[PDB]
């Protein structure tokens, strides 16, 4: 029951500020780049498909990674090890039964040992100070969906798609809180499917007017438009599945009417 929905929403809005990554961090990494991060994330999407992991598990892993890379320098050869330990941790946090560690070693094709992954897990825990219950775009979406009239499952699939697209590109997406990105994804998916718009229920609840969403929306629309050309294609291929009503086949709108 919706007894706690206001309370949880408010608390998630508090926590997302506290669980925010450093926006300008990739420029202080001497060895890694937005483009490598993009490859790592796209690979994590496939790992999650491979092991049938929940979508929340991927968003959590990417939040752990960005918070980690916010304070720890990492050589390109160790980036995938940070990614693997994050996905393991997120699976333990969020999955019913997470894959075994051996499975995580198997998925890098044995490029690290089980010990290395395990020690990296401990390091990730220490750096994150065991704070793993991070609000994600996927969580703000789920809450937002309660406000559909009526619920439309293409709208739901499509907003998830878009919210996942944003995990891939540090620039620009690390500028926005999950609640804002979720706001843009939801509007853009609604608009795409039906022509409808960020509903007034949510304007009041979130305090986000459609105008305030504008910068994030502009970016997300451009991402949506260019997705079929993007270097990384994992999320598109995922959201062609009938599970997802093939929403990632749908034609994006060429203008937003803003």
């Amino acid at each position: 029951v919706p007894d706690y929905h206001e309370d949880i929403h408010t608390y998630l809005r508090e926590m997302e500020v506290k669980c925010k990554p450093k926006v300008g961090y990739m420029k202080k990494q001497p060895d890694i780049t937005n483009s490598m991060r993009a490859i790592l994330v796209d690979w994590l999407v496939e790992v999650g498909e491979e092991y049938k992991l929940q979508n929340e598990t991927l968003h959590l892993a990417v939040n752990y990674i960005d918070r980690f890379l916010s304070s720890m320098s990492v050589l390109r050869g160790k980036l995938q090890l940070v990614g693997t330990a994050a996905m393991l941790l997120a699976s333990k946090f969020e999955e019913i039964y997470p894959p075994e560690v051996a499975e995580f070693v198997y998925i890098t094709d044995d490029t690290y040992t089980k010990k290395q992954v395990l020690r990296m897990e401990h390091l990730v825990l220490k750096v994150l100070t065991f704070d793993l219950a991070a609000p994600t775009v996927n969580q703000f979406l789920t809450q937002y969906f309660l406000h559909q009239q009526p619920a439309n499952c293409k709208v739901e699939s499509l907003a998830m798609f878009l919210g996942e697209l944003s995990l891939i590109d540090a620039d620009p997406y690390l500028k926005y809180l999950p609640s804002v990105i979720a706001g843009a994804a939801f509007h853009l998916a609604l608009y795409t499917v039906t022509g409808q718009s960020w509903p007034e229920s949510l304007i009041r609840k979130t305090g986000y007017t459609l105008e305030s969403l504008k910068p994030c929306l502009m970016d997300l629309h451009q991402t949506y438009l260019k997705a079929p050309q993007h270097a990384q294609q994992s999320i598109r291929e995922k959201y062609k599945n009938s599970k997802y009503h093939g929403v990632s086949l749908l034609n994006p709108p060429e203008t937003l009417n803003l």
Partner: peptide, 4 residues
């Protein structure tokens, strides 16, 4: 293996 991701090669970067």
């Amino acid at each position: 293996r991701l090669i970067f």
